[PDB]
Amino acid sequence: KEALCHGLGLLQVPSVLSLDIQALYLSGNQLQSILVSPLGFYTALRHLDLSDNQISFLQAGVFQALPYLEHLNLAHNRLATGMALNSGGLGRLPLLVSLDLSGNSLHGNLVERLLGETPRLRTLSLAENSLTRLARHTFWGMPAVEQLDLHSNVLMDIEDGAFEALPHLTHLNLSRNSLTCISDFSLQQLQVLDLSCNSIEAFQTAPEPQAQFQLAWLDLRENKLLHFPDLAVFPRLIYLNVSNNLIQLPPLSQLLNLDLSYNEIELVPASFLEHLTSLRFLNLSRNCLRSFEARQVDSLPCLVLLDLSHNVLEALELGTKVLGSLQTLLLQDNALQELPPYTFASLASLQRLNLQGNQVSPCGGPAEPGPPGCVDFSGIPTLHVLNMAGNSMGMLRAGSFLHTPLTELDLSTNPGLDVATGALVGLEASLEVLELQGNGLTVLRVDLPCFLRLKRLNLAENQLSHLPAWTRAVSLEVLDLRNNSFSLLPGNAMGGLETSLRRLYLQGN
Amino acid sequence: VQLVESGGGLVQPGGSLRLSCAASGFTFSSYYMYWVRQAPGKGLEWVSGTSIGGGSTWYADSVKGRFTISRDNAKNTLYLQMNNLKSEDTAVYYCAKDLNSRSYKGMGDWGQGTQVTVSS
Amino acid sequence: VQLVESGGGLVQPGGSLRLSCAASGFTFSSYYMYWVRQAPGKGLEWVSGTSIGGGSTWYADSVKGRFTISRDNAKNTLYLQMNNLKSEDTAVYYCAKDLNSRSYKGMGDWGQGTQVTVSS
Amino acid sequence: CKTIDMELVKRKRIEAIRGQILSKLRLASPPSQGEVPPGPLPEAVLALYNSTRDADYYAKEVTRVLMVDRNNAIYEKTKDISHSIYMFFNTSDIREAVPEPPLLSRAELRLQRLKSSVEQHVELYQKYSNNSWRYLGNRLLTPTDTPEWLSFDVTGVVRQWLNQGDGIQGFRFSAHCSCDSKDNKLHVEINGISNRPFLLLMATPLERA
Amino acid sequence: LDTNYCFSSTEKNCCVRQLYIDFRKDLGWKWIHEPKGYHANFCLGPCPYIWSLLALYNQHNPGASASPCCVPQALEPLPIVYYVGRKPKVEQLSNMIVRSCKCS
Amino acid sequence: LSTCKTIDMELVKRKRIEAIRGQILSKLRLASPPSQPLPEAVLALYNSTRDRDYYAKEVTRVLMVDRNNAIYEKTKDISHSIYMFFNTSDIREAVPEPPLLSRAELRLQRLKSSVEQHVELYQKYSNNSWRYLGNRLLTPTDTPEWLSFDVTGVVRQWLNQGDGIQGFRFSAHCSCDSKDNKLHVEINGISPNRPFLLLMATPLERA
Amino acid sequence: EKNCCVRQLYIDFRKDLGWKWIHEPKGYHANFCLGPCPYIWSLDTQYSKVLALYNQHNPGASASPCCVPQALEPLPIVYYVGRKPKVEQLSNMIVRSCKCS
Amino acid sequence: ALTQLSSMSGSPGQTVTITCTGSSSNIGGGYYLNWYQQLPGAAPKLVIYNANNRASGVPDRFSGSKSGNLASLTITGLQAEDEAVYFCGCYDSSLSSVVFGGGTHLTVL
Amino acid sequence: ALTQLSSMSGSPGQTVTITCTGSSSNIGGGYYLNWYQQLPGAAPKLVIYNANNRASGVPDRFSGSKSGNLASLTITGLQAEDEAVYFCGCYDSSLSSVVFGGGTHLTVL
Ligand SMILES: *[C@@H]1O[C@H](CO)[C@@H](O[C@@H]2O[C@H](CO)[C@@H](O)[C@H](O)[C@H]2NC(C)=O)[C@H](O)[C@H]1NC(C)=O
Ligand SMILES: *[C@@H]1O[C@H](CO)[C@@H](O[C@@H]2O[C@H](CO)[C@@H](O)[C@H](O)[C@H]2NC(C)=O)[C@H](O)[C@H]1NC(C)=O
Ligand SMILES: *[C@@H]1O[C@H](CO)[C@@H](O[C@@H]2O[C@H](CO)[C@@H](O)[C@H](O)[C@H]2NC(C)=O)[C@H](O)[C@H]1NC(C)=O
Ligand SMILES: *[C@@H]1O[C@H](CO)[C@@H](O)[C@H](O)[C@H]1NC(C)=O
Ligand SMILES: *[C@@H]1O[C@H](CO)[C@@H](O)[C@H](O)[C@H]1NC(C)=O
């Protein structure tokens, strides 16, 4: 059986339950002090959940009366104002593998003389606390801890040797703190590190010959770094989230995730991409990039997503044998107005392309008067996600959308746009989704009943006085028309549409 | 020292006109400048005044707002922008220098004056 | 309510002495404190007076600075550290508290007095 | 570019505002609301809050002490002249508000005029020793169409009042007579004399001095 | 260098932005009876040096700070009404509302 | 993990030095250091400036109209005030146009005083009707002391008017209970160095 | 340290700038505000000792505290340009106080 | 300083008034005049506070009066328990101290 | 504004004085009072500035006077070339403008 007590309002540890319980849940109840009785009588409890209480006073040796305890949950308590008045600490804990001490408002000496000694303890929680500084002797009572949680604290200074007493530490959380300068990384065995939501201005590591470091995840989110951290010291790195920072950019081939969004990168060096050849993710949203110089050998050959959004990119230069594994490209409102027909005409394995709010135009063909210097979208078969907006051109070309299926087309902010080619010729077993909104469309020439694989259509805020009549099989479900003038609209001749309809939106009439 | 003027002629009531005062023989961008009009048969009357550089400009109370003065210190010319003329503006608008350089004290060397009228 | 006193004793001139006023029966942390002496055969003379918490201390000019007062609200005690005792300081010192709680009005209840003699 | 996101800065400030309000009040935790009486705030507390809406880091409590009422024997000795307005304050109530004079961070004397259609340069003094008066400050009064609240920094005056015995000490609201002119009368009417004037006592609370 | 300049339209440099901090829902506080919320009105800006560029740079100093920042100049205090025990306590907190801010 | 103790002081020292050089060149609307027994007049102006909106702003002094002038004899019968008249022509010579002027400071040297005298300041308006400018409570002292009154609006009004003689009044406080109080404070250069206006103006060359 | 205060930096126009155009003053005290003011994260239940760390690190809630000056003293200088010298006052050129944002 | 006559004598049962005069800052300054009686070999006790209000524990035979710069303590009648040296104590704005008078040796037959 | 007579006649060779009286804001304000002669069919010419000083190109025959609210210009010997309308001009600080007076047509013979 189990003994769960959450919010029962009892003012003391109950004694009605027998000596046969292994999980004593007393979290959330009204407990102000844990006496020895009756808890000292219990000796076979695997879980002591006393979190979210009013715990102020503990005698010396209350927890030592338990010889078979594994979990000590003391979170959201007041052990600061009650333990600093000469109250009994934890002392020696033989087999307690999981300790939770969060929200106890401890200072450096309070946490120093609270935890005592514990030979075996997997996790140590000191989050939501008030440690001003970390000393050498802070963790001298712990031989080997795996999980360390130091977040939501008021930490500023960590002196040298404050972590060398814990040589089996893998996870280390230092988020939501105030560490400022960080130097001389010498933990040598850390796996997981967090430095997010802090105020950190620098990160330098001594370049003297030392042992190998095995760090993988290193947030530097929402900090104030000025230079990019050195990664030649960290050859096992996988994750690096340096989003929302202030870095200027004036073996190593191991990174999988790398975020530089909301940073201060005016221009990325080519040598920076040259020395990093194992990337899988790269995020840059709302940066200050000038241009992406992806025109050198062995520069990001395994990249999957290249998020370059909300920048000013006057010229994009990508070519073959440089970066040909890109899967999704997220270009949003940077500067794109006129590009040579080689970036999107010869690169392979691209599926998603974004040209929202951009003046670039697709190329034509032998029988289409394409604008000079356009961008050719024909030459890759796997490009099926295409978004175009802001071209401000009224009659699209044919040939760029051919030789490949386009499962979705996004078109918006195109005044005077008229469609007669590409969306109806060369495509028969594709084009499931094709929506036009926020653009000036007057005459519709694309035959909706021609495509039998339609599932999601939208023709909102477009000036259409006619609508095509269905006479064949179709699987359309949604048809949205917002603020569209329609004096008359019969349905008897429109009978071929009613095959899978369940919700239609239309108003403005 | 001479101050020739331009921009006379008859103006329809409620209209607008501009007068220019080319200046020579002295450092134009060192003196205050004044516009003084005189209707035929009536005495002199102050119209407008400007500092050295046009930063601070002063106009008479009866003609405030309608007239606007400005300087072009490189070309040694100064302008008076008439707006919304009415029947008591029929006067010869004289352009005048100042006694000392950085001073607002009096009218020194005067101009020949040009005749500006408003009528039907 | 009572204010027992102590510290009475002969002092060689040029010396020092500290009294105490163990006050009970009233809220000591909410009453202004005073010291009053009178030479034998003479009248009462103000010695010193202090406020809640002892932050502001006020003295008679005859013992200004040369005597110091202090308060410790925790023990409900009152201290008066004299220095440099001489001829006219031979008096009996009276502890007193103001009749109203947060006020500098008067002296409500008095102690019993401690006799200090300076001349040796 | 030196650009950072909007939504992070708002939450970073809302949190720093949480910390700043909890640090100024010297509250290590939000106070318990179990011992809070029901119903709206008392009208005295509402009036005090309306009035206060109209190392100094930490928050100082606000206490309003009103002037001695006009129908008092202290006023029937100079209330015959018309060139000055006499305001007298009870120092016992001030000491009850601020029991320890070092805790008085700032003191503010406010005046309310009824309707002043004329410009008058007015003048404020302190009832000093003997019957002499000391300069405090002057404010030129432009004409108005609505009642207007004045403000005088009398922090040093109330500090000297707290460093003295409890009695009746007050101010003189006088018109400014130029030294080349005769004695002119005071033409501005103060409410509650001719919502009577009071004091704001920005005091460090004595429980966390 | 004031609230009216950047409360009417947006100017892309160091000036005040609207921020109404509610105590009931934005901060989750139940004890401050009045005011329910106030306009803390933070300010944020990309403010460069004067030679790389106004009323913002009236008190500007590049030789006194590591980098010029968007720091409040004029601050307006706030009063609050909250209970400690049974006594309703009214206190005024200085430097709550950012009315204007400068470059440094 | 070891938080570094202090930033290297010489690095931030040269960083601040270079930023100070940039600040000095930017205040003067300059971009290069200009090149070419300097007289005692600038010594007097500089020494007056030391004792007591971004860019550097020109400073220039204009002195009192001398006491022997026939403009003070009209009000010499008044013995409870000091009358300080300034030639507006010299002010306009220092500051050619109003809007570039930004701050005007009036200086008054007191040779020796031994009394609590509370003074005031006025200006003419040429009606012999005076506006209030600002008072100053003067304590007794054994050393010469200067004073400073904010007369920015005063000199702005004087520049918006014709060149002439407009001036100040240094009158003792005379409350309505004690009228015709004599001015017991002495100002150097009037009673048997002289007072002057200190003008903070934007230079004509740079703006 | 982590406290912002004025640092003594006496800057010389002759030896530290290599300038001959500035005549008086030969040099002046130009203190600089140094100190890394860190953003102090907040909790509902924190310690009474760390409530005193706001005053010297995050006095006003800034969302990015920084070491700006608080009290500024202008500097008058005289320099020889053209045939006539001119003395001119430089506003906010000496720092007296250093306050975290 | 507060001035009051040193010696005073009256028959038992006769109402006698003790007066001490101020200096326009002792009592004329609106401050608090308190009246204290001191029996021989005993501590002073509060009798009249604020110059006109009887204290607690005093019998209702003592009345106080304040008139300008003069403070009157009127003892209605005279019994065998009023043999005390009487003091008037009040603050002043001149010496910035609480000033007492030179006590009146009130006696009987 | 500036009170000045409208017509003033005379004969050659006398010494006649042209008056100019104001209201203590223009003449009594200490501002520069000027004296302009307007020859028939010509522009006004500066004669006497600040009511004391003689302008360039003007003979010493002209002299101005300045006293309180009264300022005047004197000519010792009238000739044919002096037959002109004379304006007194001074800045007015009441109207905040440089107001002129109504000129007098000085007729010789
Ligand atoms: C380090 O601690 C931070 C702070 O608690 C963790 O971040 C939070 O994680 C929880 C997980 O449930 C989320 O709900 C929160 O939204 C996170 N907040 C922020 C600001 O990130 C973080 O996950 C911890 N890191 C590790 C490795 O445990
Ligand atoms: C100033 O305040 C004090 C106390 O607040 C007033 O003293 C009271 O006066 C009345 C009237 O004589 C007595 O009945 C009370 O016993 C006194 N004490 C208290 C605590 O109320 C004093 O009267 C006030 N001043 C004026 C001029 O009214
Ligand atoms: C104010 O200054 C002006 C010019 O500095 C003085 O004008 C001079 O007055 C004298 C008096 O005889 C004339 O000789 C000069 O020709 C005038 N101009 C110049 C440029 O010197 C004016 O007198 C002064 N006002 C005073 C002294 O009250
Ligand atoms: C990096 O941190 C930002 C902070 O909001 C977050 O949005 C983003 O998802 C993180 N990166 C990854 C790969 O999760
Ligand atoms: C006379 O006084 C009024 C107001 O008192 C003022 O506006 C006017 O300017 C003064 N006269 C002159 C000539 O300045």
Side-chain angles (χ1 to χ4, degrees), chain C residues 100 105, chain D residues 68 72 90 92-93 168, chain H residues 32 49-50 52-53:
Chain C
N100 281 44
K105 295 168 178 184
Chain D
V68 176
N72 199 270
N90 199 343
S92 75
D93 291 331
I168 302 297
Chain H
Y32 252 64
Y49 64 93
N50 190 359
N52 81 304
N53 189 358

Side-chain angles (χ1 to χ4, degrees), chain C residues 24-35:
Chain C
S24 179
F26 64 96
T27 300
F28 187 82
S29 66
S30 170
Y31 274 95
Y32 273 55
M33 294 298 103
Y34 308 90
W35 270 124

Side-chain angles (χ1 to χ4, degrees), chain D residues 106-120:
Chain D
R106 201 200 47 102
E108 178 175 357
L109 162 70
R110 291 182 180 178
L111 279 297
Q112 189 187 58
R113 325 186 290 158
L114 282 80
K115 172 60 143 52
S116 194
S117 297
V118 291
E119 170 265 341
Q120 179 151 29

Side-chain angles (χ1 to χ4, degrees), chain A residues 361-437:
Chain A
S361 60
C363 277
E368 265 294 311
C374 48
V375 186
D376 206 353
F377 299 136
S378 180
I380 187 167
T382 190
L383 212 62
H384 51 75
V385 170
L386 191 147
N387 171 34
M388 183 278 288
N391 69 323
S392 310
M393 183 278 288
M395 187 66 204
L396 77 164
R397 267 69 179 177
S400 288
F401 307 131
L402 305 185
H403 308 92
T404 176
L406 279 75
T407 188
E408 197 273 331
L409 292 94
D410 194 7
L411 288 90
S412 172
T413 73
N414 307 324
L417 189 70
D418 209 313
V419 288
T421 52
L424 202 52
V425 61
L427 274 77
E428 195 54 82
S430 59
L431 190 151
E432 290 85 2
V433 180
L434 170 56
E435 73 284 351
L436 307 101
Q437 62 272 71

Side-chain angles (χ1 to χ4, degrees), chain A residues 127-128 147 149-152 171-176 192-194 196-197 217 219 221-222:
Chain A
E128 293 179 353
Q147 296 298 109
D149 191 11
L150 295 172
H151 74 252
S152 298
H171 297 72
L172 176 56
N173 205 332
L174 285 180
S175 62
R176 209 180 282 221
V192 166
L193 181 51
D194 205 329
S196 43
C197 312
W217 175 309
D219 291 331
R221 323 198 280 104
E222 315 168 18

Side-chain angles (χ1 to χ4, degrees), chain A residues 198 222 244-245 248 262-264 286 288, chain D residues 1 3-6 8 12 15 28:
Chain A
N198 288 19
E222 315 168 18
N244 320 99
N245 205 287
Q248 303 276 122
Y262 301 70
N263 210 292
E264 294 293 328
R286 187 268 187 189
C288 283
Chain D
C1 290
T3 70
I4 196 66
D5 210 351
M6 295 298 103
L8 286 190
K12 281 196 73 177
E15 203 68 28

Side-chain angles (χ1 to χ4, degrees), chain D residues 66-69 71-72 74-75 88-90 168 196:
Chain D
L66 294 159
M67 65 180 288
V68 176
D69 207 354
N71 76 358
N72 199 270
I74 191 65
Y75 290 103
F88 281 131
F89 282 88
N90 199 343
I168 302 297
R196 56 187 173 90

